[PDB]
Chains A and B, each alone.
Chain A
Amino acid sequence: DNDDLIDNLKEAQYIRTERVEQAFRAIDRGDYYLEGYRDNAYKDLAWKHGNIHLSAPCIYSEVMEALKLQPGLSFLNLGSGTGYLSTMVGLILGPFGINHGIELHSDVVEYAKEKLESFIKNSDSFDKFEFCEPAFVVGNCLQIASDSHQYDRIYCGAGVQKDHENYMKILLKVGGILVMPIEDQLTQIMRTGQNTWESKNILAVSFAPLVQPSKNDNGKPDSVGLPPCAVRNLQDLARIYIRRTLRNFINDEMQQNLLREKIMKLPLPESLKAYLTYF
């Protein structure tokens, strides 16, 4: 089961740390895998089927390890797929992260939205964290709008072509990290200056090489562009502070949230939304 494989990965030091430990337990494998099988996410095998190419098992263990994911930074996912890893990273980053992903097939995107709604409405770990919900766009991995701001953490969801390597290096903010299976070889890259980069290897992996664009005489190239960064509105902020306060009390007392959130001197729609996020 999930905890079985989580323990095995800690045994192989594929998890190691506590933050990744909590992320992995929070999300159950198979949840994000196709409706017909719901069995093999718990095995290190090929999870390529239809258009889905997820790698929850030790592959994603290694990737999560390579990426630090300290709270408050920004994570950009090229080849998001079913959103499994965007979800996990959101669990860690915290409310004030920037979490964006890009994908080529729209039907899979509809699938990913269905899975997120499933997770919010049915999972048990949601109210144990300040989750960060990922946002999605449709497009190709090589045609991001040309004026993007930058991103601290960049990940390539599939095999990367050498003759576009620098095309991604230009995206990384001064000081960030980039993780990619270039030539199906997993590696880390660090922007140590304005026009200097350094790199290291990780592991020899197996991935399908990406599909390059072929559109011409159109504004597809380097145009897609990630979702706008916006400063949210007061209900979300205030909700977060109130949930902080109550969880802190409950931590002190431990030495159930739903019951507390229901006695608060508030209008019933406010009870449901402003805290409960509609259960």
Chain B
Amino acid sequence: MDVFLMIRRHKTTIFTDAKESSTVFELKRIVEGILKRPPDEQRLYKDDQLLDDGKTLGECGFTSQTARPQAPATVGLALCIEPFSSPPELPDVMKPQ
């Protein structure tokens, strides 16, 4: 089974996938292809770590378990991510909370 992964940037997110044996640069190229976005002062960061310009395999912290279909492994893409809208829902009486 491949690995479900989700990347962020501002108000646009990507679902994507790869192998454990892949490098970071492959992810950079998938992103640059899907978004047609050349690296004008933008790279790939893990939970906000530069990863320099990529082309590495030793620092893959996206092990398979953390990149599941039920749950993504998150990539941290001047950075600013707009989060979602937090659930405007309450216990609603029927759920004594």
Contacts and interface: CB of A to CB of B under 8 A. Distances in A.
Interface string B58-97: 0000000000000000000000000000000000111110
A28 to B, nearest CB: 32
B87 to A, nearest CB: 14
Contacts of B93: 263
A245 B95 contact: yes
Nearest to A249: B96
Nearest to A260: B94
A264 B91 CA distance: 11
A149 interface: no
* Chain A interface category by residue count: under 10
A116 B94 CA distance: 31
Determine which residue in B92, B93, B94, B95 has the highest number of CB atoms from chain A within 10 A of its CB, and name it: B94
Interface string A174-190: 00000000000000000
Interface string A235-275: 00000000001100100000000001001110000000000
Contacts of B96: 249
B92 to A, nearest CB: 7
Nearest to A263: B94
A79 B92 CA distance: 48
B92 A265 contact: yes
A35 B89 CA distance: 51
Interface in A147-193: none
A258 to B, nearest CB: 13
A141 B95 CA distance: 48
A264 B93 CA distance: 9
Nearest to A261: B94
B63 to A, nearest CB: 24
Interface in A83-110: none
A265 B90 CA distance: 12
Contacts of B92: 265
Interface of A: 245-246, 249, 260, 263-265
Interface of B: 92-96
9 contacts: A245-B95, A246-B94, A249-B95, A249-B96, A260-B94, A263-B93, A263-B94, A264-B94, A265-B92
Given A245-B95, A260-B94, 7 more contacts: A246-B94, A249-B95, A249-B96, A263-B93, A263-B94, A264-B94, A265-B92
Top 6 A-B pairs ranked by shortest CB distance? A264-B94, A249-B96, A245-B95, A260-B94, A263-B94, A265-B92
